[PDB]
Design a protein around this ligand. Sequence first.
Ligand SMILES: [Cu+2]
Length: 99
Amino acid sequence: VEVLLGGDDGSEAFLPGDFSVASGEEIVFKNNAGFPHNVVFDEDEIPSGVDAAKISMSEEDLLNAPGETYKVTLTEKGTYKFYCSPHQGAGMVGKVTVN
Ligand SMILES: [Cu+2]
């Protein structure tokens, strides 16, 4: 699945923002507009025994040009909440359910 970081209008949302993937399916986050964006997984809201450091972007690495990607694959089944650091306050949060 591909997930846009920002709507074209600069809306601060993941698109889609609440989706499902199979274990092992690649998630392609694509910088869209309204950047800077990144993707961090909330360690309190992901399945037990998943290291959030392995699936989150590096803290200082922000996507700042259109089309730039961050690719990640989740395996442990469950729900995962993730967010954009800069726009967390503004409601740029998402949810993926791995099945
Ligand atoms: Cu953002």
